[PDB]
Write a protein that binds this ligand. Sequence first.
Ligand SMILES: *[C@@H]1O[C@H](CO)[C@@H](O)[C@H](O)[C@H]1NC(C)=O
Ligand SMILES: *[C@@H]1O[C@H](CO)[C@@H](O)[C@H](O)[C@H]1NC(C)=O
Lengths: 48, 49
Amino acid sequence: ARDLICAQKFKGLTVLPPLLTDEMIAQYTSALLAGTITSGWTFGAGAA
Amino acid sequence: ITPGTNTSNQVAVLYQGVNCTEVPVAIHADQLTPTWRVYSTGSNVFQTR
Ligand SMILES: *[C@@H]1O[C@H](CO)[C@@H](O)[C@H](O)[C@H]1NC(C)=O
Ligand SMILES: *[C@@H]1O[C@H](CO)[C@@H](O)[C@H](O)[C@H]1NC(C)=O
């Protein structure tokens, strides 16, 4: 077995994890959604 | 992870995609570059994703 990604890990073929985690991307999306819902488009041109 | 030669000569080393437990720095097996070795407990070893 040994999966497929582990097999590719050998022979010097690795994967670099993303700098921004999925949780941080979700937090960005939630902040954008909250800004759009509460402040409309005002927060995109200054303070909310 | 050097913060710049001008600022300081202290550096940090990031080993990519390896668990710290089975491959630490203090092992006498000399995992390549025998003279190039970080101190065993210079700073706490942090395991990141
Ligand atoms: C480091 O950079 C600062 C910023 O320009 C500079 O003033 C300083 O002289 C530099 N350090 C050395 C040792 O030259
Ligand atoms: C590293 O190995 C130790 C002992 O086998 C284990 O407890 C730990 O979960 C491992 N860490 C990772 C990130 O795989």
